[PDB]
Each structure stands twice: as C-alpha cells, then as structure tokens.
Design a protein around this ligand. Structure first.
Ligand SMILES: Nc1nc2c(ncn2[C@@H]2O[C@H](COP(=O)(O)OP(=O)(O)OP(=O)(O)O)[C@@H](O)[C@H]2O)c(=O)[nH]1
Ligand SMILES: Nc1nc2c(ncn2[C@@H]2O[C@H](COP(=O)(O)OP(=O)(O)OP(=O)(O)O)[C@@H](O)[C@H]2O)c(=O)[nH]1
Ligand SMILES: Nc1nc2c(ncn2[C@@H]2O[C@H](COP(=O)(O)OP(=O)(O)O)[C@@H](O)[C@H]2O)c(=O)[nH]1
Ligand SMILES: [Mg+2]
Lengths: 260, 429, 183, 113, 439, 39, 439
C-alpha cells in the first residue's frame, strides 16, 4: 500500500500563498579490481565538488549557488491586516457587477497621513478581502484625493519599497499600477518622488525585462511586469523633473530617455 | 598624480602608521625623514606620498583623525610616527564614545573643520591631486562616523578626484563592540555614495591568514596590519614605479567597477608563506595566481565559492614575462567560467610593475569585486535588524541628535545593495 | 483576549455587579485583601482592595501573564472611590513601533516623568467617588510622540475602592452614558 | 625584576635649517631599559617653551640595532653613542640606581658628562 | 588629559578608595610622601598619572579624589595614616555627627548640610581637569551616609555638570550576609539616585568577594582589607585602558555606550580573574581561555548573581598584560559555543573587548600574586532581577509592619517616599524582565 | 646577575635591501634591463 | 604531546607515585624544585618531558599527576617531602578520614564527596595535554581507598573520556602474605568494576617483589621502598618508548590491541630483568639473550603467579638500552624453541617487541645496578585464573557465613553486590579456562 501526493501547483489547493504569507490563512474572524592492468585508457575520477573551485584542476561541473534575487520572498506582516481586523478602516465591499470599496465615513475629511500609509502597506496582501480593499482604496484615494497626498510621500515610500521587495510578480504589477496612479495625482508629486528613487527603483531594475507573433491574448489584466516597469519608468521621467532622467539612470543603467 | 591619505579612528591610525612604515621602506626613507635609497627609481616618484621640506625631510601627505588623543600620542610614539607633520595631528578633548552619532554629528562637526582645512592645504600643495585615500573601521565611533563625514565633505569639494577607502568591517566572531552593526549600517550608505572604491578588510580572515597560511604563533595587530600595509602599497605600486603594463587608481576603477553602486572589493596578497616554508616554496606566476584566487587567502570573511566575480584585478610586481601572467588568467577564466560572469568577458584586469615589494622575488595584489560580498553585508543586516526590532542601544544614538528614520534609511541602503549584488550575480545573457 | 471580539462604544473589563466579577483578573494578594463590600455612599456592593504595601497586593487583567488584552478603545474610565490613602494604577499598551509602553498614575507620585518604558504621573483625587478618565492615545502622543494601537494589560493596585472599569472610544458625556454606567 | 629599569640620559645634536633664533638644537632624552623584558623606551622632557606641541617619545619595545640585532644593556654605555631607527643619542649620565647596579655588576661607569 | 575624578562616600567608600589609591600609587611609582623617587621602579609612560594625579611644579602628585564621610573617625584616621603627605588636606571632607545608618538623615538633615561644601570642593577638583572623563564614585547603598549623601551628591553633580560620566562602583547588600537591619531601606531609597542620576552602576556586594577570597586565595580569614584590595584591583583593571597604552584602549564613554542598552538598564555585574595566591601562581599554565572561562564561572563573580538565572545582555572584557587579540577572539568563540550560558536574542554581538599592555601590579604584603596576564569582566545581564526581587522582598517584609519607618519620617522624609521607592523597584525588576523577554 | 605584550611589537630596524640582486641594489626597470646601449 | 596522566589512588598508589616521580625527575634531569639548572650537551628547546611534566612560563615543570587519597597523613608527608616545590599544591587531593579498608566506604560514602573534586583536577590536567595518550592508574585493591575510590574514579573516567587508554598497575592481594583481613572482599568487589572500566590491568603484588629482591638484588630485608622503586623502574621502562627514540616505538594504546584477546581478558603478568645488584652485575655478562631468559623465567616475575600453570596468550617485551633488533630476534627464537613455556594453539604469533635506545637509569636510594640494557615483559597468560581462583576461594570462605559483611553493607552497598560480583568472578575464571583450552 501507499499514499498519493497530488500536484497542486496552480490549483485551488496551492500552498504557495500559505507558505509565503504567514499571517494569512485565517478564517473570517480572529568487489575486485585491476592490480596489474595499469593502462593509459583510463582517466582520473572527476572531483566535481564545491571545494574544487579555484583549484589547479578546476571547479569542473560545480557551480556557485544562485543568489536568489528572483526568489519569491515571504510577505512581512502588514499593519493593514491588524487595522482592518480592529475596525479602524471604514472600508467595506459593495458586492455587485464588479466589486468596489464602500466608505462608511466621510472620505474627503479622513486624515490621509493616518490612512494612506496603511493602504499602501496593504498592497502586499495575498487573500481577499485584504488585498482588494487595500488596492482599491489606494486607487480611489490617489485618483481623487487632492493636494494632501503630497505631504505624505516620505511615509509612503516605505510601504511601496516593502511591497516591491517581496518579489511576487503580481504584487509588483499591483504596486506599479498604484505608483502610476500616485504619480498622476498632482503636479509636484513627481518631483517629490524623484529624490526617493534610491529606495523604489532597484526592484524595477530587477524586473525590467521579465515577461510572461503569438498574440498576448490576456492583456486587459495587464500583468506584464516588464511592460509595467517600462511604462512606469517612462511616466516617471515624463512627470518628474530636470534631474529625473539622471536619477533614474543612476539606478537603471539600461534605461533610455524619452523626453530627450 | 599625488595621493593624499587620511587615517580615521584607532584602527585607521594604526593601519596608516604601518602603511607609512612600509611605504618609507619601499622609498628608502628613514624615520628621520631623509632619503637613503640606493636607486634613482625610489626618489623618481616619491612625490605621490611624500612632500619634501627645505631640509630634505619627506613628510607623508597624511592627515590623522581621532577624538581620542591617547592613541594619537601612541601612533607617533612609534619610530615611524615621527614622519607625520605635527600640525596634521588633529584630535579632540572628548573621545568618540564608540558612537557613530557622536562621532558624526556632535564631536564630528566641531572638529571636521580643521581636518578639511589641512586636507585642502595638502590638496593645494599637490601638483595634480589624483585622489584621496582613507583608512578606517566601520565598527568604531569616529573611524566610521567622522570618517564618513570626512568622505562626504571631500566628495563635495573634489567630485572628480578618485576616492579610496579601506574599511575594516567588523564581524560577530571578532565582535569587540556591541554597536558594530549599528555603526556599519550607518556608515555603509555613506560609503556607497561618497566613495569611488571601498576595499574591505576583515579580522577573521586576517587571523585565518596569520594562522593557516603564515603559521606564526602570536602575531598581534602589528603583523595583522602589515598585510593591510602591503596591500595598500601594492595598490599604487604601479603609480610609484614604472612597469610593462602601467595602471593607476582610475585605471582600476574603470576596469573594475561595472556600476556606480558596486564598488566593494575583497583583497588578497601573494606570496604568503611561513618562515620555515619560505625556502621550500618555488615562487612562480602559477603559484602567485593560485594564492590570489585561493579562498582562504582572501582577507575578508566571504567565501568566493558562494558568489561570482563581477571583476578581478591583478597588480603584479616583479620582473616577469607577460603571456604567462595573461595565460594564468586564461586558465582561471576557462576552468572557472562557472564562477565568473558570462556577460563580462575576461573579468580579470592585469597590470605589471617591475619593482617588487622589498624582500620578495615576485609578488602580486588582488582586487576582487565578487558578488559574495552581499553575504557579509547581510550578516550585518540581520544583526542590525535584530537590535533594531527592540531598538536597544538606540538612546545613545538618538540623544546625540540622530533621527529615528535614519536607521531605516540605512537598512534600505543595505538591502538595496544586497539586492543589486544578487541581481548581478544571477543575471544571465 | 478581545482581538476577535467586537470593540466599539463600550467595553467593561471590571464590574462590581457580576456574580464573579474577577473572571479575567488575578488577585495577586500579599499582606492585603480583595473583597466585595457594600459602600454606604452608593448603597451598593463594590470591589474593595486593601494592603499595607501598595505594590505587593493588586489585581491585574488578564490573569494569565502570557495572555494579553486587545482593546482598541483609546479612553479608559474608572469609577473609583478615594480612600484618602496611597493609590496607583498601571496600563500597559502597545505602540505603533511595537513597544510595550507602560503608563502609571499614582497619588504618592511627586512629578510626572518619562523613561524609555514607563511614564509615571501624579493624580489628585477629590473626596468621595471619582470618575478618572485616561486618554491613552493623547497621553501616548504627549509622552512618547508615538501612535497608540491598543492596550495590552490593566493592573490597578490595592488600597482603594472600585466600582467599574470600562474602555470607551470617545469622551462620552454623563448624560450620554448608559444607565448601567451611571453612579 | 618586574620593576627594574635602567636609566640613561642622552642628548641629540640636530642641525636646524632656517631658524632666525638658532642653528643647532639639543634634544635631551631619557632611555629606560626594562631588565624584565630587555625592552627600551625613549622619553623627552616637556619644556615650558620648547615650542613643541608634544615631545617625541618611543614606546617600550625590543629596539633593534640598524643591522637588526636587538639592543641589550651592553650597547647602552655612558659617554658613548647609541644609534637606532636612524636616531643617534650620546649618553652622558645615569641615575643612582643604574650607577650602583653597574658598580656591583662590575662595569665601571664613566663619570657624568 | 583624560582626567577622572574619584569620589568616596561613606566609611565603606572611604576604605574602598584607600585601597584603590594605594594600588594607584604602586602602579604610578608615587611614594606615600606624594613624589616619585630619584630611581623609578615603574618605568611607565610619563602621562600615566595624569588621569589620577595632578602634578605640582614642586614635583608632587596629588590624587584627584574627594573623600566625604559624615563622621570623623575614618577621615581623621586616614589623615593620621600613612598617606598624610599624599592626600590633600582639603578634598578630605569630614562631618561632625554621623548619619547613623539612616538614608533620610544622610539625604535631608545632613546631606544638605555637607553637599554645598562637597560641591565647592568638586568645583576645584574639576577646574584643574581639562579633559575630565567623569566621576568614579565608591560608596555602599546599605549605609546611611553612603546612600543618602551619595544620592544628593549625584543629584547635584548631574544637575550642574551636564552629561559627564558617572561610574558608581557601589557595594550592594548581599543576599544573606548583611551588617545592618535598615540596610534594605537604605538600598531601596538610594535606588532613586542609582536609577536616574548615575550612568553605570557596578555591584560589589561583600558575599561574592568573601567566597572568592575563601576559594581562590585559599585564605581562611579574609577581611574588609582583602575585599577592598580586590575592589581596587578591579577598578585599576577597568581604568588601565585609559591609564596606559594597549591594543584596544577604551575610555569611560566607550564602554558606557556598549554596556547600557536602555537608560534604566545600567546595573552591571563584575568579575575578576585570575585571582590566585603565590602558592598556586607558579604551578598553573595561565592561558587566555582558562582565565576567560574562570571569569565566566560563578567562582569569579564579584556579585552574588548566578548567570543562568538570566540572559547576558552586554559583556565587556578588560584584558591586562600579554593578552593577544585573537586569543581574546578564541576565548569569545568558545564562550559563544558554550551552551550553559546564553545571551539575549536581540543582542547578537553582545561583546566588548579592550586589551591593555600593563600587567596588574601586586601590593606587597597582600594576597594577590604576580600574574603575567589578567582580565576583568563588567557585564549587563538580566540575572539581576533575582537579587532586586530579594532585596525589595526584604523591604516589603519590613515595610508591611512599618518597622523602622518613623526614623526615616523624622529626618525630613515624606512617608510616601518608601512607596515611591518600592514602585521604582517593582518597575525595575519587571522592566528587566521586559528587556530579557524573547522577541 | 640579571613575555609581556611589549615583546610582540616588531618594527623594522632600517631600510632593508632588495633580494632581487645579490648586491642588494634596488632593481632596474624592464626598460633599463632590456633596452641598453648595443654591444 | 603524547602525555600520560598519572593517577595515584590510595596509600600504595601514593608511594609508588612518589617512587615513579623520583625516577622520572632523575630521567629528565628535573631538580626537586622543578627546573633544569644548566645543560649544554642536552640541547635547549628539547622537550621529551612533555608526557610527564608540563612547562610554565617561568621555566618550571609540574608533573601531570593526581595524588588522590581519602586520608591525610600520606599526602601531608608527600607535601612536606623533598618535592615541595615540584608537586602542584592542587592535583594533590587529600580527604578527611580513611576508607577503613572498606570498599563500600571508599565507593559510596567518602568516595562520593571527593570523586567530583578529583575529576575536576583530572580535567584541569587533561585540558592542558593536547595529545594525551591515556591514564596510568596506580592503586592497591587490598585497601579501602584503592579499591572503592579507584573503582569510582575509573567508572566516571570511562564515561567522561570515552575509549581513552587506561593502564592500571594494580596491586592485587598476594597468595598468603596480607596486610589486611577484608582484603579478599575488597579485591573481589573492585575486580568487578575494573573488568568493565580497565583497559589493561597489571599484576603488582608484594610477595613476588620480596622474593625477587631477596634472591637477585641480594638484600636480606627489602621493604615497601624497594618494591615501589622496582615498580617505578618497570613503569619507566614501559613508558620510555614514547619518551625516547627507538627502532620499535610503541605507545600506551598500541599494545592495548595486541595484549587483550577478549574484552574480559586484560590482567597481565609483568616481568623485569636484569634486576640484579651491582654485586653480581659485573659477574654476569647481561646480554640480550640472558636478560630475555631471565625475564621469561617465572622466578623473576613480579607477581606470585605461575606462567607454567597456564599458557601465554600474548607477550610484549620492552627492550631498553643498546638492544639490537637482531638480538631481539635471536632471543625470541630461542624462547620459541623452549618447551616449558608454551603459547595457546590459536595465537601462533603471541609476541610483541618494542626497542628503545635509551639505557635504563640507576636511582640513588635504590639497590638496582646500572646496565646498558634491560627488558620488561607485559604478558597476558591464562595463569591469572590461578590467582583469581585463590582469591575467590578466600572470598567464598569469608562470605560462606557472612563474616565482615555488616561492615560493608552498613556504608550503603547492596547485600547482593557481594554475590553478583562473585558470579562475575566465576564467569571470569570460566572464560579463563575455556580460552586456555585448545581447539
Ligand atoms: N567592601 C566593603 N564594604 C564595607 C566596608 N565597610 C563597610 N562595608 C559595608 O557597607 C555597608 C555600608 O557602609 P557605609 O557606606 O560606610 O555606610 P555606613 O555604615 O552607614 O557608614 P557611616 O554612616 O559613616 O556610619 C556596611 O553595612 C558594610 O556591610 C569596606 O571597608 N569594604
Ligand atoms: N608496593 C607497595 N604496596 C603498598 C604500600 N603500602 C600499601 N601497599 C599495599 O596496600 C595493600 C593494603 O591496603 P592498605 O594498607 O589499606 O593501603 P591502600 O590500598 O592504599 O588503602 P588505604 O591505605 O586504606 O587508603 C597491601 O596489600 C599493599 O600491597 C607500599 O608502600 N608499597
Ligand atoms: N587590523 C586591525 N584592526 C584593528 C586594529 N585596532 C582596532 N581594530 C579593529 O577596529 C575595531 C574597533 O574600532 P575602533 O578602534 O573602536 O574605531 P574608533 O573608535 O573610531 O577609533 C575592532 O573591531 C578591531 O577589529 C589594528 O591595529 N589592526
Ligand atoms: Mg591509608
């Protein structure tokens, strides 16, 4: 007798989400030999060991371990989950044709300095409803927030950084779309984002040229991480400043200027 | 192409004192400052490190830097500490307190003005200032903090001139300071932006060299810094003496640094052998190359087997033929191409200077921009995060004027540099 | 314990009317006593804690030290009777940077002071029954420059008379208070 | 033998290049020879107006002769020249402790110069 | 340069400082008359005494110390002792009537009586110091004057000298041996100053030094003299890094930063080894690993504090002699590999090292033997929670019946000061528990 | 009749001659060695 | 390197250790103060004494010995003896009161309160040695300490040090001369522990030494001093292979695998010759063949056991001096040609030889004569069954009606321990006769 282990990759029972988001997974609440045959038609036994590297014979087939820059990292705990479970966010799901975010309290008057960082911290989420609520709240606040988005930028850089460092392609695409909507929200916000290129760009440079005559029939989703990186880089250069190009080049050597 | 040097902190002062001893040996300069070399070549290019006085005294172009005056007294209490000009000894009344914030903002600012003044005087005296050299430790108070403030100000004043640092990064196995990760994290982000090239020196690897390789029983910091002095002289041997394949510091920087952030290098010296095995060893280019690329010969704690070489540099010294020194690189590349990056063909830069370090048939210094430096950057990164989760030993830094978010910014710089090194380690064609 | 429970409006942690009011409280008693008595002022039974040493004997919620509270409500209202004797209370809260910060108020304290884990205050209590209101969020901002997340533990020391301890989200008025929260 | 230190007063004759006030400088130093270790240290008295920021000293260690051999107590002799690290001192006097020790050891110390 | 001012409070502080100063005089070749002889025995650097002795143009070296006891016996008897010409006629302040083992008496009635003149003396102690590192205060918190007057002096020094270093090498009441009955009262009341107005406090309780002398020295009848000699050896080991040259020289502030994780957490254990007699000195191979292991052993503890009851938070080692840096590193490596002792989770480094080239000196006629190398440990650990809990448990036992409280009440102290002290303690033990709790 | 840390300090006595030649003279450059007056 | 740790347990152990260390000091030119005055021909920096003496930074050598005894007179006499400065103040452990010839007393009551200290001393000995070959244990099972405390120490050393070599030069009771009456009880009880925790045990009784010294050494009245000197000569001859160069260098653990055929078979005859007085030393041409014949003679044996009443399962000769390997082969061949001495049928080889070039010494205070060559046999033979049958018959006679059993059982030993150890010795003698049996 025996037991079978099904291949659950890309299925409803895929454990990748569970193993990459520890806080997730909760419910709605909470022998002889030759001794005279010395012949020249035999070659020495190859080493093929990690210690063989830089030896006189050579490393051989041994290779250094991968650094794992593309390794899909674990999601760090997000304050969005705890705040939502506590009830701080006046956010609900308005079920219907396409789900949307319903705001319980007046939304034009809520403290952006207190709420928007939580929403940007929530982009790292991986299960409903946390990820959807965070991303859609980000979209709404950035689309129609006003001039109060600009002062919050320095405390918004860290959540964007942490979402980018997760190396999850879906999270990268989501935070890229949210970043584009952030950039097209005001006038000076791009110039304010320029000095913080040092903390937002490395993941974009890493994922610049990653792609998922054959027509890409799935394109309304816009999950192409490399295309999103290129588009957001061009949009940053457009709605940046005079030093935006040089600041972008300082971190993405393969970038090509658009305004010039 | 004059080079002006600075020694920050106790570690920096000791390393610089031994380095100036070695350089005076190579140029035939006694502690009295008079030249007694037997050849023209030593005096031909002595102006790169030494400035001649009215009486012929060759004063080193060095500035000493430490808040503690006791070690400033001790460093010139040595025989070769009489070389330095008395006015270059700049010190404060109160020590650094082994605090990066105290050495960078409170006591650093109140003292950095005189250091910039003397450094500017030296730069003006230079006919053509090639660059600035710094020797310090990332774990100390004033060696790290005040050193980074100094490098920032010299970067601001002289942007195009070459910037060099020799940083003794502390590590837990030789952890003789509980705030070593704090200081290293607060200094690494300054070093990334303000340093053209930053050589890394490590105490575990130095002791590994002194025990496993040199076999001598009990060498102290003197013999420990002898190796760093030999390396720091072999970096600019090509500047100080002519050779078949000349090189300078921007030579190395251009042929060694692929991207602006990636300028942290591992060091190695050859030959290195015990006294009893000196006469049993046959010196040759093959032996030199094997000691260069041998993992245990590296003087920083990061195994090259765990990473890939962005670039390597071979500063050979001694009368040697050229196709064999190039053929050693041929062999290394060909039979370790798995450990070398494909999209950078011929990762090894080579240069030859005929004049060898005194007392050796033939020698070589190795510069290594391997991607495994990310491992030792991380091994300080998790330590910093461990102390920063509880934010212990942080009231000392915050009461000296530092801001809370600066530590997170330093974490950001560490993680970004590590991510860049990982990306370019696993990047394909 | 209240992380998964409803936390809005009012949340009583101690009430002198329940059958066994100290379900979630550890009566750490040394040279003292905790008992339910009948107060002549209000003609009702209230908690009554005595002790020669204020520090040794006290009551702490939750009883299990590893376990902790999860109340988000920034206001803490305590109906306690001034016994003309030394009194103190302790509130451990969790700040946004994830430290346990510890706000204490005592009547024997001279002046307020802030130390990297604790913030000690003096209190002045009028004769008779008192309604002490403790605004955790505002005082955390004032004494630490740090946001208030939620309170972890409440520990009111001995040598006092206690009616009801309850957390509220906002500064409710006396008229707006429910009849069972009155005095 | 932990605290046994021989004293040797000496002076250094040092020409001065372009000083309006003087052409020669005499640097009076004291050599301490630790009989425990054989180490030697050089100290210089700090004068009130010597013009030096801090005096030139030499921390105790095994001071070698220019050839390479370490300097023992035999090399240090009163009225004689001791050379090390390119620096030459003419010994002229000792303290009573060193004087008596040399007397009983048998070496006749020259009278102070 | 690098001046440090010694303060001695109480009779216990007086004897501790007397031993410290004889040891300093032996180390710096200063005869009891106050001047070095014509034939030096030390051969140490010329600036070694500058941190502890002011050099007068006549050639005499005056200690930079202030003795301050509220009763004249000890001070006058030192004035008549061997160091008459060594010690300054001033800087030797004597009170007329004793504090009588009462913290309130030594802090309110007589502490304010003598504190003005104490600060007047300290002003001229400090004006001659151009690089004053800090004040090293020796006292015993279990006495009356040593607690109350020490507290008031620390308050005034902190309020007038800014953020100068305060190294309080104080003697705590021992777990079982205690010479006074109001001693826990004095300790708990002095904790007010020892938590706020001092920088780094070192415990020197008598029982651990007693056991060290009984076991290591193999001497059956050790006394306050031996205890004070050991304390002076520890102080000299701590200050040798700034007194003399070394591989890793550290001043007061250098380990002040490394040894204090939080402002409250500054009470640090101490332990010195190898401490051996002349009989066993020459028959043992004193190695760096052996001496470090003996230091980490409870035998080497100078405090009655078992390390296994807590977690080490930050250790600092002061090696003296021919100690080699990688020898130190090998000792540290074997200590980390050792499992019976554990460090707190959030402090992975946790180790400070400083090597000095001056071997420890030996007092003639003493019990210490000539050692080629030695090492002194100063360590902040969470194991102090048990001793603090025992001392305030004794305080609670006496204060439950309000015994001996009228004595403190009548000397100008409000009766609620006892409750305030108990609150400060109860905060301290379980804030130590907080910092030792796993993340 | 008459091993501390002061033993371990080793400092070079003076300028040490090269071992490249038997005479100890500082070596000539490759140019000077190979490109001389023709014989 | 190649250190051997000496462990002298009991009175007999202390005496033989004193003799052995006198002999070793005379071997290595170590004065009673513990230093070599001046040696020019003997090259400097030559350390052949590392296996017995550990150096100190002052140039003084300390023996690697532990003198463990439960009663103080012998250890105190050794303390006051000639080797005051030589022997370590510690490593010289002396108890309060003797084991009273009681194995239970030495193994359960006073042995327990001293074995921990003895093991601490042993650890302090062993950590110094980086190449420890093994433990050389000297004791007499006849007494109380040498039986019980020796058993306890060996039992704990086995688990503490794993499979480290243990050479116990043990003094078992003699056939008819006894210095005690409960001696058979002590021997029977200790043999059980020694079987499990003794790698090789060596016969060292007293009657054979007395008879050998009376016949060959030609002195009418030998005593314990002469016996101990002969024992020390045997030990030095056995251990000199790792002390000096030779054609056949052998370590302590090397003959462990050659002399022990079965795990329960480890009790070995010892012989030494030429043990002759200077009266006949010049009379006899003491050649290699002559000394080998005298060694193989049962008369020259150092135990009162009969090789001819058994079969030599194995032998290990140690030639010391100018012995040629050719002469060794000649002696071995002429021994094999003999008939009276015979090997077992399953061990045709049965021979081991080790040649050291250093000639044996002569010790002043002893009756031995200087010879350019000597040889010591360590041989496993089935004849040990005779002595064990004799001692266990004595044990059965004593335990038949339980004489002296209350004394043993009072200390805390099980009453069934006597019986169970007796079946142990019964199985021991059984496997003796069955391994002596032919195929
Ligand atoms: N280590 C050490 N401890 C001492 C010494 N003398 C006394 N002590 C202890 O320290 C405690 C307090 O002593 P002090 O600081 O002099 O306070 P005090 O006893 O009240 O002194 P007075 O008020 O002047 O009488 C005593 O209970 C002793 O146990 C000493 O010489 N060395
Ligand atoms: N060779 C030799 N044997 C001795 C000496 N002293 C005692 N013995 C042996 O010790 C045996 C008797 O045991 P004890 O007299 O009790 O001595 P012990 O075995 O050391 O035990 P305790 O003295 O009781 O501690 C005798 O059979 C002797 O063989 C000695 O000086 N030389
Ligand atoms: N190689 C070498 N390293 C040293 C020396 N002195 C100190 N260090 C290293 O420097 C670190 C401490 O630096 P520190 O002296 O406190 O720097 P500072 O406070 O700025 O003077 C330690 O981790 C040592 O490993 C030396 O002489 N040689
Ligand atoms: Mg006996």
């Amino acid at each position: 007798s025996y037991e079978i282990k099904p291949i659950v990759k890309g299925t409803k029972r895929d454990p990748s989400l569970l193993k990459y988001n520890k806080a997730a997974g909760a419910g709605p609440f909470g022998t002889h030999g030759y001794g005279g045959a010395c012949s020249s038609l035999r070659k020495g036994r190859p080493r093929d060991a990690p210690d063989a590297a830089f030896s006189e014979k050579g490393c051989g087939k041994s290779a250094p371990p991968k650094a794992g820059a593309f390794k899909k990292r674990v999601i760090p705990p997000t304050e969005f989950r705890r705040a939502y479970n506590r009830g701080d966010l006046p956010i609900a799901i308005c079920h219907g044709s396409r789900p949307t975010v319903d705001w319980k309290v007046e939304v034009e008057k809520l403290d952006y300095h207190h709420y928007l960082p939580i929403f940007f911290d929530g982009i790292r989420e991986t299960e409903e409803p946390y990820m959807f609520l965070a991303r859609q709240g980000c979209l709404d606040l950035l689309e129609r927030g006003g001039s109060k988005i600009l002062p919050t930028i320095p405390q918004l850089i860290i959540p964007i950084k942490t979402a980018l460092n997760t190396r999850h392609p879906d999270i990268i695409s989501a935070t890229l779309r949210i970043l584009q909507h952030l950039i097209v929200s005001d006038d000076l916000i791009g110039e304010a984002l320029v000095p913080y290129y040092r903390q937002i760009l490395p993941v974009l440079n890493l994922f610049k040229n990653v792609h998922k005559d054959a027509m890409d029939y799935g394109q309304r989703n816009r999950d192409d991480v490399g295309d999103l990186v290129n588009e957001t880089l061009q949009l940053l250069e457009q709605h940046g400043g005079d030093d935006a190009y040089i600041n972008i080049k300082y971190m993405v050597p393969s970038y090509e200027s658009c305004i010039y | 192409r004059e080079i002006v040097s600075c020694q920050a902190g106790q570690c920096g002062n000791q390393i610089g004192s031994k380095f100036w001893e070695v350089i005076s040996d190579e140029h035939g300069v006694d502690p009295t400052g008079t030249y007694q070399g037997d050849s023209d070549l030593q005096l031909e290019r002595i102006n790169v490190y030494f400035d001649e006085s009215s009486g012929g005294r060759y004063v080193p172009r060095a500035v000493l830097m430490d808040l503690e005056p006791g070690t400033m007294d001790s460093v010139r209490a040595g025989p070769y500490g009489q070389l330095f000009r008395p006015d270059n000894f700049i010190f404060g009344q109160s020590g650094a307190g082994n605090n990066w914030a105290k050495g960078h903002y409170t006591e650093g600012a109140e003292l950095i003005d005189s250091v910039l003044d003397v450094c500017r005087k030296e730069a003006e005296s230079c006919d053509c200032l090639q660059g600035f050299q710094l020797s310090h430790s990332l774990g100390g108070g004033t060696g790290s903090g005040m050193g980074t403030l100094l490098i920032s100000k010299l970067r601001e004043e002289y942007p195009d001139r070459i910037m060099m640092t020799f940083s003794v990064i502390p590590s837990p196995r030789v952890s003789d300071t509980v705030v070593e990760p704090y200081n290293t994290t607060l200094s690494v982000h300054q070093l990334v932006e303000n340093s053209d090239e930053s050589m890394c020196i490590d105490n575990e690897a130095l002791y590994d060299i002194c025990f496993r390789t040199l076999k001598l029983t009990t060498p102290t910091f003197g013999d420990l810094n002898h190796l760093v002095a030999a390396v720091m002289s072999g970096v600019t041997c090509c500047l100080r003496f002519p050779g078949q394949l000349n090189s300078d510091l921007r030579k190395l920087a251009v042929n060694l640094v692929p991207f602006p952030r990636l300028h942290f290098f591992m060091m190695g010296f050859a030959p290195l052998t015990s006294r009893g095995s000196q006469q049993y060893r046959g010196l040759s280019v093959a032996e030199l190359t094997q000691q260069m690329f041998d993992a245990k010969n590296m003087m920083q704690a990061a195994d090259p087997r765990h990473g890939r070489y962005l670039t390597a540099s071979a500063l050979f010294r001694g009368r040697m033929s050229t196709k064999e020194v190039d053929e050693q690189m041929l062999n290394v590349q060909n039979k370790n191409s798995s450990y070398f990056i494909e999209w950078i063909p011929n990762n090894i830069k080579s240069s030859i200077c005929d004049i060898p370090p005194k007392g050796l048939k033939m020698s070589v210094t190795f510069i290594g921009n391997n991607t495994c430096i990310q491992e030792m950057f991380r091994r300080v990164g998790e330590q910093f995060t461990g102390m920063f989760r509880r934010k212990a030993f942080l009231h000392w830094y915050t009461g000296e004027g530092m801001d809370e978010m600066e530590f997170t910014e330093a974490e950001s710089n560490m993680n970004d540099l590590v991510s860049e090194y990982q990306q370019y380690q696993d990047a394909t064609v | 314990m209240f992380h998964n429970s409803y936390q809005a409006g009012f949340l009583s942690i101690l009430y002198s009317i329940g059958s066994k009011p100290l379900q979630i409280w550890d009566s750490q008693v040394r040279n003292g006593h905790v008992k339910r008595v009948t107060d002549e002022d209000i003609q009702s039974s209230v908690l009554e804690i005595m002790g020669s040493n204020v520090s040794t004997c006290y009551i702490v919620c939750p009883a299990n030290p590893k376990q902790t509270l999860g109340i988000k409500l920034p206001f803490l209202v305590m109906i306690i009777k001034n016994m003309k004797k030394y009194f103190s209370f302790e509130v451990t809260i969790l700040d946004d940077k994830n430290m346990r910060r510890r706000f204490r108020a005592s009547n024997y304290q001279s002046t307020t002071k802030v130390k990297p884990f604790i913030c000690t205050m003096p209190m002045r209590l009028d004769e008779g029954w008192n309604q002490i209101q403790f605004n955790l969020s505002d005082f955390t901002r004032r004494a630490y420059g740090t946001n208030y997340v939620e309170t972890l533990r409440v520990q009111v020391h001995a040598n006092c008379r206690i009616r009801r301890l309850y957390f509220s989200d906002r500064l409710y008025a006396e008229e707006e208070l429910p009849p069972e929260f009155k005095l | 033998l932990t605290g046994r230190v021989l004293r040797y007063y000496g002076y250094c004759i040092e020409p001065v290049s372009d000083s309006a006030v003087e052409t020669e400088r005499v640097r009076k130093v004291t050599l301490h020879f630790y009989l425990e270790d054989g180490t030697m240290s050089v100290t210089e008295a700090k004068q009130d107006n010597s013009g030096f920021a801090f005096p030139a000293n030499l921390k105790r260690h095994i001071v070698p002769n220019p050839d390479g051999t370490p300097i023992t107590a035999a090399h240090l002799k009163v009225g004689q020249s001791v050379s090390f690290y390119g620096r030459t001192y003419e010994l002229y006097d000792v303290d009573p402790f060193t004087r008596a020790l040399l007397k009983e050891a048998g070496e006749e110390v020259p009278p102070p110069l | 340069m690098r001046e440090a001012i010694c303060i001695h409070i109480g009779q216990a502080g007086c004897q501790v400082g007397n031993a410290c100063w004889e040891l300093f005089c032996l180390e710096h070749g200063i005869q009891p008359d106050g001047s070095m002889p014509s034939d030096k025995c030390i051969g140490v650097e010329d600036d070694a005494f500058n941190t502890f002795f002011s050099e007068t143009g006549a050639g005499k070296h005056v200690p930079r110390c202030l003795f301050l006891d509220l009763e004249p016996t000890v001070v006058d008897e030192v004035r008549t002792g061997t160091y008459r010409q060594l010690f300054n006629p001033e800087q030797l302040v004597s009170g007329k009537e004793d504090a009588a083992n009462n913290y309130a008496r030594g802090h309110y009635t007589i502490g304010k009586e003598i504190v003005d003149l104490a600060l007047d003396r300290i002003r001229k102690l400090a004006d001659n110091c151009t690089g004053l590192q800090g004040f090293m205060v020796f006292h015993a918190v279990g006495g009356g004057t040593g607690s109350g007057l020490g507290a008031l002096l620390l308050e005034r020094l902190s309020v007038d000298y800014g953020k100068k270093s305060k190294l309080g090498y104080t003697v705590y009441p021992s777990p079982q041996v205690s010479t006074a009955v109001v001693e826990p009262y004095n300790c708990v009341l002095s904790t007010h100053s020892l938590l706020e107005h001092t920088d780094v406090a070192t415990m020197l309780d008598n029982e651990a030094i007693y056991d060290l002398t009984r076991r290591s020295l193999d001497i059956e009848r050790p006394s306050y003299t031996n205890v004070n000699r050991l304390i002076g050896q520890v102080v000299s080991s701590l200050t040798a890094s700034l007194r003399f040259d070394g591989a890793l020289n550290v001043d007061l502030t250098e380990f002040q930063t490394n040894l204090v994780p939080y402002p409250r957490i500054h009470f640090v254990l101490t332990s010195y080894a190898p401490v051996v007699s002349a009989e066993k000195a020459y028959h043992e191979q004193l190695s760096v690993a052996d001496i470090t292991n003996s230091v980490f052993e409870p035998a080497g503890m100078l405090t009655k504090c078992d390390p296994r009851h807590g977690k080490y938070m930050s250790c600092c080692l002061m090696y003296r002699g021919d100690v080699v840096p990688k020898d130190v590193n090998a000792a540290i490596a074997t200590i980390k590999t050792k499992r019976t002792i554990q460090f707190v989770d959030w402090c992975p480094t946790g180790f400070k090292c400083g090597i000095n080239y001056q071997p420890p000196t030996v007092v003639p006629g003493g019990d210490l033997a000539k050692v080629q190398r030695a090492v002194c440990m100063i360590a902040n650990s969470t194991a102090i929670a048990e001793v603090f809990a025992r001392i305030d448990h004794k305080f609670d036992l006496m204060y439950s019946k309000r015994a001996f409280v009228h004595w403190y009440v009548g000397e100008g102290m409000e009766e609620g000061e006892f409750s305030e002290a108990r609150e400060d303690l109860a905060a301290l033990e379980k804030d130590y528990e907080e910092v030792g709790a796993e993340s | 009749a008459a091993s501390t840390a002061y033993q371990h300090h080793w400092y070079r006595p003076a300028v040490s001659s090269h071992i490249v030649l038997a005479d100890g003279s500082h070596p000539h450059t490759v140019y000077q060695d190979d490109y001389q007056a023709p014989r």
